[PDB]
Amino acid sequence: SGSDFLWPAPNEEQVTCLKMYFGHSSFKPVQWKVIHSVLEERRDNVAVMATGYGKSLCFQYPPVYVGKIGLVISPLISLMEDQVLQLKMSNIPACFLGSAQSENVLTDIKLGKYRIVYVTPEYCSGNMGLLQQLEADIGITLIAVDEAHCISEWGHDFRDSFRKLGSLKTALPMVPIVALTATASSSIREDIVRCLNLRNPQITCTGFDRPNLYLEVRRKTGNILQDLQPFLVKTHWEFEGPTIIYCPSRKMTQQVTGELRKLNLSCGTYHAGMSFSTRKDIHHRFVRDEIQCVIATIAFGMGINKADIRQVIHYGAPKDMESYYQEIGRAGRDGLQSSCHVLWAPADINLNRHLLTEIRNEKFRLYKLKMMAKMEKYLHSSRCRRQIILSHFEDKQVQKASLGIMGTEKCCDNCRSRLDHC
Numbered sequence: 001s002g003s004d005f006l007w008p009a010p011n012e013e014q015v016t017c018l019k020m021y022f023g024h025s026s027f028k029p030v031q032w033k034v035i036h037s038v039l040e041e042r043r044d045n046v047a048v049m050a051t052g053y054g055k056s057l058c059f060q061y062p063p064v065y066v067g068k069i070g071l072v073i074s075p076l077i078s079l080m081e082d083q084v085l086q087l088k089m090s091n092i093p094a095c096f097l098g099s100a101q102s103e104n105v106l107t108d109i110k111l112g113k114y115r116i117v118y119v120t121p122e123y124c125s126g127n128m129g130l131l132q133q134l135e136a137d138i139g140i141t142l143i144a145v146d147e148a149h150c151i152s153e154w155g156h157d158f159r160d161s162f163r164k165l166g167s168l169k170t171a172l173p174m175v176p177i178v179a180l181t182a183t184a185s186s187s188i189r190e191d192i193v194r195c196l197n198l199r200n201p202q203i204t205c206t207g208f209d210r211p212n213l214y215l216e217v218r219r220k221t222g223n224i225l226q227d228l229q230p231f232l233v234k235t236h237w238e239f240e241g242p243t244i245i246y247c248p249s250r251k252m253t254q255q256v257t258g259e260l261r262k263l264n265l266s267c268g269t270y271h272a273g274m275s276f277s278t279r280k281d282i283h284h285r286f287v288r289d290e291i292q293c294v295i296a297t298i299a300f301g302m303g304i305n306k307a308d309i310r311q312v313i314h315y316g317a318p319k320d321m322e323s324y325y326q327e328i329g330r331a332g333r334d335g336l337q338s339s340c341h342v343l344w345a346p347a348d349i350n351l352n353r354h355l356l357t358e359i360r361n362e363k364f365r366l367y368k369l370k371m372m373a374k375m376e377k378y379l380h381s382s383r384c385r386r387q388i389i390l391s392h393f394e395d396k397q398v399q400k401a402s403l404g405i406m407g408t409e410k411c412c413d414n415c416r417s418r419l420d421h422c
């Protein structure tokens with residue numbers, strides 16, 4: 001909560017604002033990433049949130065914190081009016097601006113008395129000069145475009161009223177745009193970036209429970225082949241399916257690869273010491289199944305994009321929950337059943353607090369120590385693995401919306417253990 005597991009850390013005024021105006025004790029990680037990128041980098045965002053829950057804070061918090069104006073563009077009239085009501089209940093001045101609004105409300109908006117102004121895309125397109133005046137006189141913290149996938153002619157819910165939003169960025173090039181959508185289509189996402197003319201946006205995709213990922217944590221034996229043989233099938237050996245093994249160091253990547261090659265397994269390594277071309281080559285041979293297993297040290301699994309990854313193994317404790325989340329999310333993109341196993345020991349590199357002693361920035365040292373503790377608590381836990389992840393990353397509505405995976409044999413090792421004999 002507060003500033004605990006977030007870097008850069010929210011400052012005390014930011015936490016106070018969150019408590020006082022939104023009634024929350026913590027930012028979720030994606031919410032902080034959006035908010036911070038807006039406040040400090042003035043950066044465009046595309047935020048895909050699978051359920052739609054949790055997006056409001058991303059565009060409401062920044063203008064409230066800095067005391068300026070946020071514009072929210074949406075076609076969902078009744079929901080916008082609802083949100084205006086809720087804001088005013090929290091002492092946040094907000095209004096829904098349209099043609100029928102009085103010149104006194106318009107003057108109040110020009111005077112900066114409203115933190116959050118909701119408009120339809122049609123009104124917005126008809127009143128660009130007003131928006132520019134608000135930017136010149138007060139400063140627009142961000143423009144939020146909800147239902148942003150509606151700008152795409154390739155999607156099923158295109159609205160003509162969204163086309164003209166392409167001019168926001170040319171009329172207001174310094175104002176960040178936060179485009180929000182629930183649609184998990186990569187091409188719709190690219191279309192949003194293109195049609196809104198966003199500039200190097202931060203792109204985030206969150207809000208999933210990933211029902212086809214089975215989660216398990218096992219202790220290491222200390223013998224690499226003894227540890228990995230359960231993931232192999234014999235008669236010669238091979239992996240059960242395409243596999244990524246994440247290792248915390250290049251030395252361990254080389255050790256693991258050497259051991260697996262003793263069994264003539266088709267492997268490739270993948271780390272930052274390689275040329276961009278060499279890593280592309282390994283990625284391509286993995287995609288076409290010339291290699292069955294990639295052993296990698298690259299953070300987040302960046303660049304390992306393959307539809308049918310059936311197994312992810314973390315060989316050693318992961319670095320922290322954010323890297324773990326990104327790295328196992330690489331699995332099972334085709335929707336078929338996959339498994340994500342961590343093999344760990346308390347002596348693992350990513351749990352060695354002595355490696356943090358020399359950090360000079362006190363706030364960063366605390367962040368790294370908190371992230372180690374949180375990772376270790378996950379690995380040692382008896383609780384549902386998926387519930388731990390969703391509680392850390394998602395707000396409570398997302399967790400409650402999850403249906404049909406948690407508590408079943410397909411969810412995780414701890415859920416399985418609570419169904420079997422205990």
Ligand SMILES: *CCS(=O)(=O)Nc1ccc2[nH]c(=O)n(CCC(=O)N[C@H]3CCN(C(=O)Cc4ccc(C)cc4F)C[C@H]3C(=O)N[C@H](CC3CCCCC3)C(=O)NC)c2c1
Pocket residue numbers: 029030033048183184185186203204205206207208209210213322325326327328329330331333386389390
């Ligand atoms: C959502 C985009 S999409 O168009 O639907 N396509 C998609 C689907 C699946 C993917 N797997 C991937 O590796 N990638 C590429 C990178 C991502 O977009 N990663 C996303 C989605 C996958 N993911 C998870 O499933 C994590 C996960 C694991 C276990 C459970 C129980 C739930 C769960 F969600 C990871 C996720 C991701 O890494 N998100 C990044 C942003 C967050 C990082 C952590 C801190 C908060 C922000 C991100 O968007 N990075 C670019 C896809 C693509």
Ligand SMILES: [Zn+2]
Pocket residue numbers: 383384385386387406407408411412413414415
């Ligand atoms: Zn579970």
